[PDB]
Amino acid sequence: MTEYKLVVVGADGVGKSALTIQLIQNHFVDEYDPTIEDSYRKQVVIDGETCLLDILDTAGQAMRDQYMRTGEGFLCVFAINNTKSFEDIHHYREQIKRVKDSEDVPMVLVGNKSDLPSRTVDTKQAQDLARSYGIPFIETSAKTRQGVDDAFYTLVREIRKHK
Ligand SMILES: Nc1nc2c(ncn2[C@@H]2O[C@H](COP(=O)(O)OP(=O)(O)CP(=O)(O)O)[C@@H](O)[C@H]2O)c(=O)[nH]1
Ligand SMILES: O=C1N[C@H](c2c([C@H]3CCCN3)[nH]c3ccccc23)c2ccccc21
Ligand SMILES: [Mg+2]
Protein backbone atom coordinates (compact mmCIF):
# COMPACT_ATOMS: atom_id res chain seq x y z
CA MET A 1 0.00 0.00 0.00
CA THR A 2 1.41 3.36 -1.09
CA GLU A 3 1.71 6.02 1.60
CA TYR A 4 1.29 9.71 0.74
CA LYS A 5 2.61 12.44 3.03
CA LEU A 6 0.29 15.43 2.60
CA VAL A 7 0.66 18.90 4.15
CA VAL A 8 -2.24 21.33 4.57
CA VAL A 9 -1.01 24.94 4.54
CA GLY A 10 -2.67 28.34 4.46
CA ALA A 11 -3.43 31.49 6.40
CA ASP A 12 -4.67 31.51 9.99
CA GLY A 13 -8.39 30.81 9.80
CA VAL A 14 -8.89 29.52 6.26
CA GLY A 15 -10.17 26.16 7.52
CA LYS A 16 -7.16 23.82 7.29
CA SER A 17 -8.21 21.89 10.39
CA ALA A 18 -11.93 21.86 9.57
CA LEU A 19 -11.16 20.40 6.13
CA THR A 20 -8.86 17.72 7.53
CA ILE A 21 -11.28 16.80 10.33
CA GLN A 22 -14.11 16.49 7.80
CA LEU A 23 -11.99 14.08 5.76
CA ILE A 24 -11.03 11.99 8.81
CA GLN A 25 -14.07 12.21 11.07
CA ASN A 26 -16.95 13.25 8.75
CA HIS A 27 -18.09 16.16 10.90
CA PHE A 28 -17.72 19.93 10.92
CA VAL A 29 -15.84 21.69 13.70
CA ASP A 30 -17.53 25.03 14.36
CA GLU A 31 -15.03 26.04 17.05
CA TYR A 32 -11.91 28.08 16.27
CA ASP A 33 -9.11 26.15 18.01
CA PRO A 34 -5.76 27.40 16.62
CA THR A 35 -3.46 24.56 15.59
CA ILE A 36 0.18 24.07 16.58
CA GLU A 37 0.80 20.90 14.58
CA ASP A 38 -1.46 17.83 14.30
CA SER A 39 -1.21 14.68 12.22
CA TYR A 40 -3.94 12.37 10.97
CA ARG A 41 -4.08 9.16 8.99
CA LYS A 42 -6.75 7.61 6.80
CA GLN A 43 -6.79 4.61 4.48
CA VAL A 44 -8.76 5.37 1.32
CA VAL A 45 -9.38 3.87 -2.10
CA ILE A 46 -8.46 6.32 -4.86
CA ASP A 47 -8.96 5.23 -8.47
CA GLY A 48 -9.32 1.60 -7.43
CA GLU A 49 -6.17 1.42 -5.29
CA THR A 50 -5.78 1.59 -1.53
CA CYS A 51 -3.78 4.59 -0.31
CA LEU A 52 -2.57 5.55 3.16
CA LEU A 53 -2.86 9.30 3.69
CA ASP A 54 -0.45 10.63 6.32
CA ILE A 55 -1.72 14.20 6.72
CA LEU A 56 -0.02 17.05 8.58
CA ASP A 57 -2.32 19.91 9.64
CA THR A 58 -0.12 22.97 10.12
CA ALA A 59 -0.32 26.23 12.04
CA GLY A 60 -1.44 29.34 10.19
CA GLN A 61 -0.11 31.60 12.94
CA ALA A 62 9.08 26.39 13.29
CA MET A 63 8.96 22.83 11.99
CA ARG A 64 8.09 24.49 8.69
CA ASP A 65 11.34 23.89 6.79
CA GLN A 66 11.25 20.27 7.97
CA TYR A 67 7.64 19.51 7.02
CA MET A 68 8.07 21.16 3.62
CA ARG A 69 11.07 18.90 2.98
CA THR A 70 9.23 15.74 4.04
CA GLY A 71 5.86 16.55 2.48
CA GLU A 72 5.14 15.01 -0.91
CA GLY A 73 2.14 17.18 -1.77
CA PHE A 74 0.57 20.36 -0.46
CA LEU A 75 -3.00 21.56 -0.14
CA CYS A 76 -2.72 25.35 -0.40
CA VAL A 77 -5.90 26.62 1.23
CA PHE A 78 -7.46 30.09 1.13
CA ALA A 79 -10.96 31.19 2.14
CA ILE A 80 -13.23 32.54 -0.58
CA ASN A 81 -14.42 35.34 1.73
CA ASN A 82 -10.88 36.48 2.67
CA THR A 83 -8.85 38.19 -0.06
CA LYS A 84 -5.72 38.41 2.12
CA SER A 85 -5.63 34.61 2.42
CA PHE A 86 -5.86 34.31 -1.37
CA GLU A 87 -2.89 36.64 -1.84
CA ASP A 88 -0.98 34.70 0.83
CA ILE A 89 -0.95 31.69 -1.53
CA HIS A 90 2.02 33.27 -3.33
CA HIS A 91 4.01 33.20 -0.09
CA TYR A 92 3.29 29.53 0.64
CA ARG A 93 4.03 28.60 -2.98
CA GLU A 94 7.35 30.46 -2.91
CA GLN A 95 8.46 28.85 0.35
CA ILE A 96 7.65 25.35 -0.95
CA LYS A 97 9.67 26.02 -4.10
CA ARG A 98 12.56 27.24 -1.93
CA VAL A 99 12.72 24.29 0.49
CA LYS A 100 12.16 21.65 -2.19
CA ASP A 101 14.26 23.33 -4.92
CA SER A 102 11.80 22.52 -7.70
CA GLU A 103 9.16 24.28 -9.77
CA ASP A 104 6.94 21.17 -10.09
CA VAL A 105 5.91 20.26 -6.53
CA PRO A 106 2.53 18.47 -6.32
CA MET A 107 0.02 21.05 -5.09
CA VAL A 108 -3.69 21.80 -5.20
CA LEU A 109 -5.24 25.24 -4.75
CA VAL A 110 -8.24 24.96 -2.42
CA GLY A 111 -10.83 27.69 -2.03
CA ASN A 112 -12.64 26.90 1.21
CA LYS A 113 -15.77 28.29 2.92
CA SER A 114 -17.82 28.09 -0.30
CA ASP A 115 -21.00 27.99 1.81
CA LEU A 116 -20.55 31.51 3.19
CA PRO A 117 -22.40 34.44 1.56
CA SER A 118 -19.45 36.87 1.96
CA ARG A 119 -17.54 35.82 -1.17
CA THR A 120 -14.75 38.13 -2.34
CA VAL A 121 -12.70 35.78 -4.58
CA ASP A 122 -14.64 34.62 -7.61
CA THR A 123 -14.00 31.27 -9.28
CA LYS A 124 -12.25 32.90 -12.26
CA GLN A 125 -9.68 34.63 -10.01
CA ALA A 126 -8.80 31.34 -8.34
CA GLN A 127 -8.80 29.36 -11.59
CA ASP A 128 -6.44 31.94 -13.13
CA LEU A 129 -3.99 31.68 -10.22
CA ALA A 130 -4.02 27.88 -10.30
CA ARG A 131 -3.45 27.89 -14.06
CA SER A 132 -0.52 30.27 -13.61
CA TYR A 133 1.17 27.79 -11.26
CA GLY A 134 0.14 24.70 -13.25
CA ILE A 135 -1.95 23.15 -10.45
CA PRO A 136 -5.57 22.04 -10.03
CA PHE A 137 -8.20 24.14 -8.25
CA ILE A 138 -10.96 22.75 -6.01
CA GLU A 139 -13.67 24.69 -4.17
CA THR A 140 -14.60 23.28 -0.76
CA SER A 141 -16.84 23.73 2.24
CA ALA A 142 -15.79 22.05 5.44
CA LYS A 143 -19.29 22.88 6.70
CA THR A 144 -21.26 21.03 4.01
CA ARG A 145 -18.38 18.64 3.10
CA GLN A 146 -18.45 19.87 -0.53
CA GLY A 147 -15.24 19.02 -2.34
CA VAL A 148 -13.41 17.68 0.72
CA ASP A 149 -12.67 14.18 -0.59
CA ASP A 150 -12.03 15.59 -4.08
CA ALA A 151 -9.44 18.07 -2.78
CA PHE A 152 -7.35 15.42 -1.03
CA TYR A 153 -7.85 12.81 -3.77
CA THR A 154 -6.82 15.32 -6.45
CA LEU A 155 -3.60 16.00 -4.55
CA VAL A 156 -2.82 12.27 -4.40
CA ARG A 157 -3.32 12.14 -8.17
CA GLU A 158 -0.80 14.98 -8.55
CA ILE A 159 1.73 13.02 -6.48
CA ARG A 160 1.09 9.84 -8.49
CA LYS A 161 1.83 11.75 -11.72
CA HIS A 162 5.02 13.27 -10.28
CA LYS A 163 6.39 9.79 -9.53
N1 LIG B 1 -18.91 28.31 7.24
C1 LIG B 1 -17.70 27.71 7.19
N2 LIG B 1 -16.86 27.88 8.24
C2 LIG B 1 -15.65 27.28 8.22
C3 LIG B 1 -15.24 26.47 7.08
N3 LIG B 1 -14.00 26.01 7.34
C4 LIG B 1 -13.65 26.49 8.56
N4 LIG B 1 -14.64 27.25 9.07
C5 LIG B 1 -14.63 27.96 10.36
O1 LIG B 1 -13.53 28.86 10.36
C6 LIG B 1 -12.93 28.86 11.66
C7 LIG B 1 -11.47 28.45 11.51
O2 LIG B 1 -11.40 27.10 11.04
P1 LIG B 1 -10.08 26.23 11.31
O3 LIG B 1 -10.19 24.91 10.60
O4 LIG B 1 -9.75 26.29 12.78
O5 LIG B 1 -9.04 27.15 10.51
P2 LIG B 1 -7.45 26.96 10.52
O6 LIG B 1 -6.85 27.47 9.12
O7 LIG B 1 -7.04 25.56 10.83
C8 LIG B 1 -6.90 28.04 11.86
P3 LIG B 1 -5.17 27.80 12.32
O8 LIG B 1 -4.18 28.23 11.14
O9 LIG B 1 -4.91 28.70 13.50
O10 LIG B 1 -4.95 26.28 12.79
C9 LIG B 1 -13.70 27.85 12.51
O11 LIG B 1 -14.66 28.59 13.26
C10 LIG B 1 -14.42 26.99 11.50
O12 LIG B 1 -15.68 26.48 11.97
C11 LIG B 1 -16.21 26.33 5.98
O13 LIG B 1 -15.93 25.65 4.97
N5 LIG B 1 -17.38 26.97 6.10
O1 LIG C 1 9.81 14.53 8.64
C1 LIG C 1 8.68 14.67 9.25
N1 LIG C 1 7.82 13.65 9.43
C2 LIG C 1 6.66 14.19 10.17
C3 LIG C 1 5.38 13.88 9.45
C4 LIG C 1 4.30 12.91 9.73
C5 LIG C 1 4.26 11.97 10.87
C6 LIG C 1 2.97 12.08 11.66
C7 LIG C 1 2.72 10.67 12.17
C8 LIG C 1 3.48 9.73 11.24
N2 LIG C 1 4.31 10.58 10.35
N3 LIG C 1 3.37 13.03 8.75
C9 LIG C 1 3.69 13.98 7.84
C10 LIG C 1 3.05 14.44 6.70
C11 LIG C 1 3.65 15.45 5.94
C12 LIG C 1 4.87 16.02 6.30
C13 LIG C 1 5.56 15.59 7.44
C14 LIG C 1 4.99 14.59 8.21
C15 LIG C 1 6.94 15.61 10.37
C16 LIG C 1 6.18 16.57 11.01
C17 LIG C 1 6.69 17.86 11.07
C18 LIG C 1 7.94 18.20 10.52
C19 LIG C 1 8.74 17.26 9.87
C20 LIG C 1 8.24 15.97 9.80
MG1 LIG D 1 -5.93 24.62 12.38
Author numbering: 1 to 61, 66 to 167
From the paper:
The 3 human RAS genes, KRAS, NRAS, and HRAS, encode 4 different RAS proteins (KRAS-4A, KRAS-4B, NRAS, and HRAS) which belong to the protein family of small GTPases that function as binary molecular switches involved in cell signaling. Oncogenic mutations in RAS impair GTP hydrolysis, leading to stabilization of the activated GTP-RAS form and enhanced RAS signaling.
Importantly, this compound series led to an affinity improvement of 5- to 10-fold, with the pyrrolidine analog 15 displaying an NMR KD of 440 µM. Given the significant improvement in binding potency of these compounds, we reverted to the use of the naturally occurring T35 construct, with NMR KDs being easily measured despite the reduction in visible cross-peaks for the G12D, C118S double mutant construct. C118S was introduced for stability reasons in NMR. As designed, the carbonyl oxygen of the dihydroisoindolinone forms a H bond to T74 at a distance of 2.4 Å, and H bonds involving the pyrrolidine and indole nitrogens of 15 are formed with D54. Important for further optimization was the observation that the side-chain position of E37 was ideally placed to form a fourth polar interaction with isoindolinones substituted at the 5 position.
